[PDB]
Amino acid sequence: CTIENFKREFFPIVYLIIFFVGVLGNGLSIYVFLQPYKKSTSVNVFMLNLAISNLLFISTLPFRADYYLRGSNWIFGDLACRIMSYSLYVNMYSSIYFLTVLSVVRYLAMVHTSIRSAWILCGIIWILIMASSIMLLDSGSEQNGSVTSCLELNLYKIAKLQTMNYIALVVGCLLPFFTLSICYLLIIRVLLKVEADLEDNWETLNDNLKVIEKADNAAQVKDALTKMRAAALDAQKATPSPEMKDFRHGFDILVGQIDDALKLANEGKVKEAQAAAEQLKTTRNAYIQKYLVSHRKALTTIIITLIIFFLCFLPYHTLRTVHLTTWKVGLCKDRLHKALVITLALAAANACFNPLLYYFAGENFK
Numbered sequence: 001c002t003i004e005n006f007k008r009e010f011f012p013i014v015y016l017i018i019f020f021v022g023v024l025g026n027g028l029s030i031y032v033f034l035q036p037y038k039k040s041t042s043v044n045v046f047m048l049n050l051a052i053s054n055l056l057f058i059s060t061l062p063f064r065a066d067y068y069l070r071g072s073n074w075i076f077g078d079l080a081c082r083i084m085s086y087s088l089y090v091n092m093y094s095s096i097y098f099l100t101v102l103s104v105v106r107y108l109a110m111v112h113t114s115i116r117s118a119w120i121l122c123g124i125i126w127i128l129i130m131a132s133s134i135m136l137l138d139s140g141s142e143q144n145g146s147v148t149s150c151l152e153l154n155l156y157k158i159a160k161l162q163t164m165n166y167i168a169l170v171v172g173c174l175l176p177f178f179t180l181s182i183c184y185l186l187i188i189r190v191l192l193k194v195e196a197d198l199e200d201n202w203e204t205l206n207d208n209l210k211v212i213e214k215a216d217n218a219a220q221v222k223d224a225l226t227k228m229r230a231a232a233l234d235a236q237k238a239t240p241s242p243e244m245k246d247f248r249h250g251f252d253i254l255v256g257q258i259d260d261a262l263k264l265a266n267e268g269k270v271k272e273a274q275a276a277a278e279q280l281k282t283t284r285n286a287y288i289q290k291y292l293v294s295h296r297k298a299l300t301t302i303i304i305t306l307i308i309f310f311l312c313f314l315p316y317h318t319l320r321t322v323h324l325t326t327w328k329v330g331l332c333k334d335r336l337h338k339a340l341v342i343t344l345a346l347a348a349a350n351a352c353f354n355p356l357l358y359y360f361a362g363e364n365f366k
């Protein structure tokens, strides 16, 4: 209608922006991932597969942009038109599954070879999405006079797409969204548990160390040290790997330094004990810094994935469903269709948004 003028103004800009930004980001990311120097992890296998999928998709965007810059004329042949749709949807649902499986893996890593397991999972995802999407290859370039069209909805496609939507809405969108959400809510829950317990024990340690600093005799210092050691042994038990070994070691040597101070408290030597207490405080602060940095990174990756997933996909799937259920052959539903165009652009922008995850979760080590 006049939706077409908006499409021909809007799609070229956003597609070219996604293309250049995404080539840059995904190229840097894949270059980093394929280097044999750094030790390979499973999350890197998932991120590599995701970057490769997004880059394959991004390579088709110049053709989409060309199509609209020509006033919605397709010049690239019937096979390329088929590949357009195939690559769009293969990328989209492979990306959703890569993110979701990465999330399940992280949750299980907190609760509970894995490199080969990640490669097998990614191969399964590739095969699933590519096999289940093959009927998109039946849709080709349609021609009306002198204007070969592509990328459009039409009656020839509708009967398929409508049903093909719902299944894809349930299995490719809502299921992974729910899985992602539940895994990350459970992770937030375990993090809040450990942080609450750690603050609780922190408070007892601060109180009894303040008592030790404000020392009156050898009995009160020993009493405060006994309380401290009790609180510290509670924390060591409720601790639930490089980061996990450092924490257990810190807890053990903290209990050791408290036993050192208690030895001094039996001898009635008050000054020695207070010096030991000060050095124990230094140790505790070191351990807390090391934990807090890890905590912040762990939450940042989770929230970024929820934001990207949410905003890129759920508006687009919602509006795509609504647009398909109301579609009439002759009716112009300009405003809804325009909304769908905007959210389709957001969904395509995922291929250049994902390198943020590669930023934060990727190089976070040291």
Ligand SMILES: O=C(O)CCCN1C[C@@H](C(=O)O)Oc2c(NC(=O)c3ccc(OCCCCOc4cccc(F)c4F)cc3F)cccc21
Residues within 6 Å of the ligand: 007, 085, 089, 093, 128, 129, 132, 133, 136, 150, 151, 152, 153, 161, 162, 164, 165, 167, 168, 171, 172, 320, 323, 324, 340, 341, 344
């Ligand atoms: O520009 C414009 O005017 C606006 C956009 C026009 N336009 C262009 C047109 C076009 O592409 O040319 O597409 C539409 C659709 N398409 C669907 O509604 C669809 C809906 C679903 C779907 O699924 C593919 C994958 C199937 C397998 O899914 C699985 C996923 C995960 C796990 C599994 F096991 C799966 F099996 C494909 C779809 F095209 C709906 C509404 C409009 C359009």
Ligand SMILES: CCCCCCCC/C=C\CCCCCCCC(=O)OC[C@H](O)CO
Residues within 6 Å of the ligand: 053, 054, 056, 057, 059, 060, 063, 075, 076, 077, 078, 080, 083, 086, 087, 088, 090, 091, 094
């Ligand atoms: C996750 C995605 C999985 C799938 C990824 C697929 C990647 C395909 C890349 C580029 C295809 C572009 C095809 C463009 C071919 C050029 C056609 C041409 O040059 O025209 C030929 C002739 O003029 C007319 O028959």
